[model samples]
Target: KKAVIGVVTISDRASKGIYEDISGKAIIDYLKDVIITPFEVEYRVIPDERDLIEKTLIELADEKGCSLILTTGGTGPAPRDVTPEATEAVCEKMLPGFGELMRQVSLKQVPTAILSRQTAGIRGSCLIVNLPGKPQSIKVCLDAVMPAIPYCIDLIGGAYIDTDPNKVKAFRP
Candidate 1:
């Protein structure tokens, strides 16, 4: 079965067409490399408004039936950064380990990784994760957490996801 995933970029400038959505592009490219299973992506670029973020996430998980939603940007401490809060509001269970593992991986490259408030949660069968804005940071964080993602999706009753064993060995016990 083909997987349906969501790729969201929560950025004010990107939504306004002021800047290119490199963050979302990074996520899509990374998924292509790691995911051996065929999948479809429901992509979006929206402003950093908390309300819109919540609505968009809910629509993707509830209406679109996406197995996973990976969002970049809006995870910082800035006033407009509210993706985590929006995620929490819409999710039934929060998975803090995803965020912790991501930060642990990121801190190796930059001290400011601790400043990031990235998080993850489960909405029905969909697993939504918040990633850092930078393309490089997104790849690093994905490398840290992707091994567990497919198993997590299985447990949540989502579509089965298989990744390239050489790229990222997905674990299932």
Candidate 2:
């Protein structure tokens, strides 16, 4: 059977029905394009509330057994940007390298990338990654870090995620 991944979009407006959550779809589309393995996604659109974000992260990891949770939005310097904080609150182990790598790559494209506080961490078997809110920027960050994601999931004993090397090579040693 295929494993499950969680796609969470954290935005006050999107959650309140102000606008469509294209950011969430961008993450789903990115995964669909990269991962060739059979898998399912547990999707949720929540407000930029830290408590709810932490609760959702725990649910996706502990209850749903999702190997990976890709979150978009609320990673900026804004007052409501709390995805990284929520990620830190729930994770047993924090992987700062993910955010560092993402920012380094994004800085090449946009100077304000440093203001992006996207991060990743491990909560049980799940590896949660914070992605950008902008749709195109989301693709760029995903492209830079996806190669290592499957191996990270493997390290956590979650799932074997196969990918299309022609699109993005997932490394395992």
Candidate 3:
């Protein structure tokens, strides 16, 4: 089965064209290298508004037919940060381990990592995950928890995703 992945970069500056969105590109590049399955990406950049995030997520999953949706930015403790809240609002089930593992892995690198509220959930047939804003952190967080993404997608009735064993191996047990 073909996999359809959506890459959303949630940033006010990027959405306004004030800043370049290298984070979204980083995710696409990493996916190109790590994902062995044939897939297509539906990418977008939006602001930090909770309502917009919730709407876009529903569109990506329900309208665009995406199996997986990865969002970057707005996961911090700032007043504008609302990615996690938006994800929770749109999802039917919350996958707690993704956030737990992300914080655990990130805390090893930075003491301030606890401030991030990155999380993941299931929205219809799609799995949405909130990642960090920094391009480097995007890689680290994805690498830390991607092993379970494929299986999570499967449980949600989405398309199967296979990863390159040489880059990041997908776990199935």
Candidate 4:
């Protein structure tokens, strides 16, 4: 079966319809362009609340059967930016390399990249990755980490995903 991927945008204003959710759309578009294998997206927009994010992730991974969940926004160091904490709450293992690589890539563009607290983790059969809110940054982070995503999903017993090597190559052993 094709993998079920969740695209969640965590933002108080976006949830309340106060702001447009370009980040979530950027994720979907990128996935559509890069992932050559058949798959489905369980997309969502939620507030920047830790408990809510945790609950939603659990439901998506456990109940909805999502193999990968990508969350955009709420990854900053501000008090309300709790996506990383919420991800940790529901995930069993942390994928520190995702954050490290994201920071390393972003640092080449801006000095404030250190303030971004993006992270990734494993929850059940799902690999949840926290992405930046900005549309441009979302492209940067996703491009940086997507090469390993298919392999990571394979390791966790999820669906096999092919990629357009011309766009983004899928790394496998």
Candidate 5:
């Protein structure tokens, strides 16, 4: 495979099958539409538990060698929101600009963008990004940060990724 990507959906209700994991599916579809590089995905639907989130991140980065792990949900100000905390606990480097740009882009559409805790970081060979649960917000946030993701992966010695320039450009230089 050209790369391994992990798609995680962290939602209590979704995990219980109370509702479909549309956010996770949206991420998978988003990746498929944006990247020209062939990749494998390890998808998971888990609750908003801090320890499970930590374990999943470790497994995806350390065990599966995923270059990019995109996580949806658990990114709000709610009590169950804890993806960012778990991500920080495991990442060696934190990329604050990703969150900044995402918020800036989202603010153009909704004023509540500041309430989101979306963030990105690097763990071992993986780049883990916390995204919003809504499909539309997921695309917006991903677009805001996607350009730098491939180069970020390269910096961490992970699998290289290429994108369809007409869709989303992957910055190398």
Candidate 6:
């Protein structure tokens, strides 16, 4: 069955057309290479606003019926970085382990990984994961956690998300 997945890039510059949204595209490209199930992307690029982020997440989960939503950008210590806060506000359950695991992996490559506050959570039947803005780190974090995403969705009663074993092996059992 086909699933609807959302990719939201929260960047003030990108929203204003000051720079291209490579982070959002990176996520979509990675998913295309990994997911085995047929799916479509509901992509959006918006500024770093807490209320907007919360609203966007809710719309993607409830209105668009997206089983999974990956948000990039605004996971830093900067005042404008409020993606994690917005995600938490909208989520019914916070999955701290996702951020823990991602940080652990990121820390191996960069000392500044500790500064990022990326996180994940569940809202309704959808799983929302916040990723970093850098395209390289996005892949690194996703690769580290993608194996468990499908099983997590199953437990949440969301749409099925299987992945190609060659790219990312989805754990069901």
Instruction: Estimate, for each residue in 120-169, the C-alpha lDDT of model 3 and write its tens digit.
Output: 99988899998887788889999988888898788878998999988998
Model 4 reaches what TM-score against the true structure? 0.97
How many residue pairs of model 2 clash at the backbone? Answer: 0
- 69-94 per-residue lDDT for model 4 (tens digits): 99998888789999999999998999
Cα lDDT tens digits for candidate 2, 1-173:
24899999988889999999999999999899989998999999998889899999999888888999999988888888889899989889998889999999899888998898899999988999999878898888888899999999999898889899999999998
- The lDDT per prediction is 0.92, 0.90, 0.90, 0.91, 0.91, 0.92
Overall local distance difference test of candidate 3: 0.90
Q: What's the lDDT of the predicted structure labeled candidate 2? A: 0.90
Give the lowest summed-lDDT range of ten residues in model 2: 1-10
The all-Cα superposition gives candidate 5 an RMSD in Å to the true structure of: 1.0
Candidate 2: residue pairs that collide: none
Model 4, which residues run further than 4 Å from truth?
none
Error of 3 at 156 (Å): 1.5
User: What is candidate 4's local distance difference test score?
Assistant: 0.91
Model 5 lDDT, full chain set = 0.91
Candidate 1 regions off by >4 Å? none
Assess every candidate by TM-score: 0.97, 0.96, 0.97, 0.97, 0.97, 0.97
Clashing pairs in 5: none
For residue 11, give model 2's deviation from the true position in Å.
Answer: 0.9
- TM-score quality measure for candidate 6: 0.97
TM-score of 1: 0.97
